[PDB]
A paper describes a structure:
The nuclear envelope partitions nuclear components from the cytoskeleton, thereby necessitating their mechanical coupling across the nuclear envelope to enable cytoskeletal function in the structure and positioning of nuclear contents. The [name] complex is formed of [name] (Sad1 and UNC84 homology) domain and [name] (Klarsicht, ANC-1, and Syne homology) domain proteins, which interact immediately below the outer nuclear membrane, through complex formation between their C-terminal eponymous [name] and [name] domains. We find that [name]-[name] complexes between [name] proteins and [name], KASH5 and Nesprin-1 are 6:6 structures formed of constitutive interactions between two 3:3 complexes.
The presence of metal ions in the crystal structure was confirmed by corresponding peaks in anomalous difference electron density maps, and their identity as zinc ions that were co-purified from bacterial expression was confirmed by the spectrophotometric determination of three zinc ions per 6:6 complex in solution that were lost upon pre-incubation with EDTA. We confirmed this hypothesis for [name]-[name] through the finding that the 6:6 complex is retained upon zinc removal by pre-incubation with EDTA, likely through reversal to a KASH1-like interface in which the head-to-head interaction is mediated solely by [name] amino acids.
Author numbering:
A (entry chain B), B (entry chain C), D (entry chain E), E (entry chain F): 618 to 811
C (entry chain A), F (entry chain D): 618 to 812
G (entry chain K), I (entry chain L): 382 to 404
H (entry chain I): 380 to 404
J (entry chain G), L (entry chain H): 379 to 404
K (entry chain J): 378 to 404
The structure:
Amino acid sequence: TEAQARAIVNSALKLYSQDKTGMVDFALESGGGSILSTRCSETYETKTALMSLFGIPLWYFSQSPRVVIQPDIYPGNCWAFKGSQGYLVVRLSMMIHPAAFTLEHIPKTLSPTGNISSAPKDFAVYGLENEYQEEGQLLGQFTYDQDGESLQMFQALKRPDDTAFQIVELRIFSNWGHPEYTCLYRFRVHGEPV
Amino acid sequence: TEAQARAIVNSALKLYSQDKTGMVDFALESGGGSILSTRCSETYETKTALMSLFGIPLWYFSQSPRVVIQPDIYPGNCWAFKGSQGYLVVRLSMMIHPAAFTLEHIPKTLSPTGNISSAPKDFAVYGLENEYQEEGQLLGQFTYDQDGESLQMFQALKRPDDTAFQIVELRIFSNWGHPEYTCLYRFRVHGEPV
Amino acid sequence: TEAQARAIVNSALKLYSQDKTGMVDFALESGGGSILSTRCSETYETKTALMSLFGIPLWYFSQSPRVVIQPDIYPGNCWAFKGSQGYLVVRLSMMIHPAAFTLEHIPKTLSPTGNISSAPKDFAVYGLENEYQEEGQLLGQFTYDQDGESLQMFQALKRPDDTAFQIVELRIFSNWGHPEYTCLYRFRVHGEPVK
Amino acid sequence: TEAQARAIVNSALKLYSQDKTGMVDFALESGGGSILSTRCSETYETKTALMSLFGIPLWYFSQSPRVVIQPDIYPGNCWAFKGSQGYLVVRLSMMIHPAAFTLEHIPKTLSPTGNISSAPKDFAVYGLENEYQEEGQLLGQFTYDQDGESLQMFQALKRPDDTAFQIVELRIFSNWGHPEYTCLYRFRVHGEPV
Amino acid sequence: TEAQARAIVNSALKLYSQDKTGMVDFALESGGGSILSTRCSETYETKTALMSLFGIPLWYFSQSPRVVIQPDIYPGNCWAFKGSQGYLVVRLSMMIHPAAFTLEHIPKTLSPTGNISSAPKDFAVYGLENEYQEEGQLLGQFTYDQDGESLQMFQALKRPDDTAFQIVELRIFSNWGHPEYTCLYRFRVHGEPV
Amino acid sequence: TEAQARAIVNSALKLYSQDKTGMVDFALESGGGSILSTRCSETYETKTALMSLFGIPLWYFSQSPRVVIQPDIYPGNCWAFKGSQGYLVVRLSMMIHPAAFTLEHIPKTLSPTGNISSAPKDFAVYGLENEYQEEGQLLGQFTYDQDGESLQMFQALKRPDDTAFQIVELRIFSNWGHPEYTCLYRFRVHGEPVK
Amino acid sequence: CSHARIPRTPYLVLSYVNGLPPV
Amino acid sequence: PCCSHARIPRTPYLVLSYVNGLPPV
Amino acid sequence: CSHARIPRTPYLVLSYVNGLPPV
Amino acid sequence: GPCCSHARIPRTPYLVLSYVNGLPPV
Amino acid sequence: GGPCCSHARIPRTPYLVLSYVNGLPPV
Amino acid sequence: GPCCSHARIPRTPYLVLSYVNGLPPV
Ligand SMILES: [K+]
Ligand SMILES: [K+]
Ligand SMILES: [K+]
Ligand SMILES: [K+]
Ligand SMILES: [K+]
Ligand SMILES: [K+]
Ligand SMILES: [Zn+2]
Ligand SMILES: [Zn+2]
Ligand SMILES: [Zn+2]
């Protein structure tokens, strides 16, 4: 327990450096994931972050759904949609059997308003066989706990047949009380390739 | 006692993942903070980082004051002003009672010259009631220790009237001996919202 | 051993926050490092990452050699060249005596294909006195272990009269079996600057 | 008859150089005229003139309604709208009492197809008091003769109350047989300013 | 004789206004003509007309082969190729039987050097059935007279079999003595459509 | 008598087609002429011709001094300077002995306001050896007649030494009564090149 | 390819907002 | 803020799409 | 809005640095 | 004006016009 | 390959300014 | 997605960074 204690700290650091989970994120944009923007909710328009150049105002900056599959989860590095109900369709990097999903949101200790009421509360994950499929196959129905850790994992449902999926839809049903919008910081898809 | 060791390392990693402090940074740009470029020192121009495209030189790259409220603190991800005296005005994300300030600089073990003479040495923090206020209320005079840790925190002064502020001015009075410029990697503002 | 264990974990985190090595990376772009694009291999053409704006397709995105001297090592943040043989020339931030080199690659547990066969296997590091020098002084020939840790360090060759260099060439001789390309995530150069 | 001949030819050249009419064109764009692009018919889409740069196709080129108040009337320098019915509203350079209108079209001897069936046949001119007025005051109804000269002038109707106008609407009711589109090369407005 | 004189001058002005020839130019760009850039010689590089914006040099301006099928023939509105031998391939607006060709060059009275030695001297016109043809059918070999008028017309050869063409190649074999380049101001193609 | 008449009409059209003068315009931009932009007057700012794209206002359009050496002289195709006093320095296409100058303005019958009071009235032409020369050699003091023809030509002054020039300055001293600006449609320089 | 990158024709609109231009 | 009602362009969204499989990883 | 995005009215300047263009 | 003798100022950008769907409106 | 010169085409070094004009962004 | 088969979409624009006046501020 003298040298073993150093082995635990190095193992914890090794797991922390491996995207904090040590599992492949088939939704990660840099690794092959992509957003099907034509099947996502309308981005919440805020019109506050004014980008200018040489004193010339150019445009207002707002985060796109792409940030949900990007690792930077500092406060604000999140995609927001109007209301408490939204959908996000992600094309996975490979055709996999989905096994688990990961949702990340900032802790209460880092939010300026002192709360994470913009975080999603009730959501479901679906598997789509093609881009144009309206109703997909239910992969699971979960609840993100605001009193839990920042990173929360959710085990996918065992589908009866060995049906693979490369397109995933994230349907948010409710948030934690924010009356205007709902923010998604990062959404990950884990599983086994075919 | 293996579970106690895992609990200690996991608690340290949890605090490390929460912006290394577990406290709201009301100056963070992505969270709502912004730089008042009208009331900042002129950026030290070096004209060394030449950006080119198709062999056509386009412009020289230099970090703006925006990086001081951005988390990346790798060597070079810092705003520099000429000399050893400079000022930086940041608009906080919310109207807060300032309680502490955080200054970050690269350690000597990561600096190419083997020392951090460009780091600020003596500074003071002021609270401004409006953008055009010439003289603000002194919130505290501190000294960044070059022989200290990379991240250094400074407790704000206790004042009779706890007047709140949404605009903070960082006045650098001296550096640690660099004859050309002074670098600011990250400056954070912590407190309690109204 | 309780307070000592807290000292151990805090010391480990301190080394972790200092670029995971606590040593100066004279090749880091933000710190002064730069890529000599002419003296580097051609980028592997994939034409898959289609960048569009207002529905207008603009161009296909591919990582340039610059990412190799950038810290972000998430899967995909790597420069790839065709085949298993390539060369990367980096201009160091300062004239230094090279002492060690660091090569980083993603672990197999984060690769979508389940393997890191695109990682380099056999490589060598050379020291160049000028930009136009074809073949420089050999600083060390090493082998990146696919079964080793993600970050691997390599000690430079010892020499009696230490000649300094500000330009280093990384020559990849083989990969770990990928038939198309070879990926470099991050390459670091460590040493002592000249007085 | 020698000096008489030269004086006649020089007078003809003098009238030719003065915009072929020697009369003010209060609709001319360079002189103050402008097209109310909102109050015009939808431009006929052809998608044939592919503009490219470095082998990259950029866009298809089509003449805007602005060309109708531009003097260059070479074949193709005309605005076309789908069908045989179209609207064109021009804001005059000055508040004038309209007295005459000029319509220009290419001669058949310069048309590639051997006909000028795309030219307008029956049209009317209206006077509008404001931008959003739907139905204006009728200034005249005329017919462009396909067998006449390239430039044809039309005298406006005399009115009891001399009401001035700075906005004119050109309504094309029919063309000379082209089944696809109708082309307008140049439309001029003449009168006396207030 | 006054009415006879007015009819003579008005007929001359009518022919002058109809592109100075009263004949369809099936090579005119605005009328449907286009240049095959991959089937033309390289533009003579001068590096003298420096275009700048806000003091920033952008590029050197040189006329492309497109101006040859554009009506503006003021001095300089011409495409130049290196040497005294060059090729220009034009796609006609319609499939026609070529009957005549027109070559235009500035008069000596408008040239700064006092000569038109950059003008072409010996040339030939060929008809191509498709773009991929290398050597086409000879439509005529002519000579532009430097002592002649600015506009010179050339009758195509008589053919027993009536073969139509929509692609024309203009081959310049020699100029009028300019040692550096050869300039083409305007080239027209006349004929009867099918 | 008929062939003589047709020869007269063809000669008039031939002179008309040759830039209406049959003389070389060494100030013409497309032929080699250029405006020395620094050595000019301040352009009259109106902020009325708003150029927009997709409903986004981009900039206000105003004619530059370049239009004075461009042939299009339709109403509005003119450069305007504030007041009734202005300068225009033109670099000729070749080193020539100046013999005549041409000033063009729209006729009164084509102006919307019914007058050409914005036209220049009294002017002088000078020859400069370099761009930075403050006061040059007087080539002629002339007056543009508002009651004259649209195109008016002016013979250069007979000087004892036929000194050649490649830089010409046009100094406008007065206009025909416009209280705000003065418009120049086209200014031409004629002469004989050096050999 | 023959498909344009920009769907509609880029149309620069000219509007007079402060009266006549210099003539 | 140039005036009371400013015509600021719509928020630009740079879209990334994978159309030919995996990128080099 | 009616305020121009570019404060200066733009102006493409043409200057000849290497003699005559092809005429 | 160019900045130095080694300055690479580009040549003329050449906007090419091609007719791919027949005649334009005439 | 690399840049053919060391003189920048743009005289002054650009800076993208970010300013919040309508309150907080979504967090 | 590409509009047609083998749309000629240009390659990657490569923003090159070069240090010509020594170290940046660190
Ligand atoms: K994110
Ligand atoms: K920073
Ligand atoms: K990297
Ligand atoms: K027109
Ligand atoms: K031409
Ligand atoms: K003009
Ligand atoms: Zn405004
Ligand atoms: Zn230079
Ligand atoms: Zn296509």
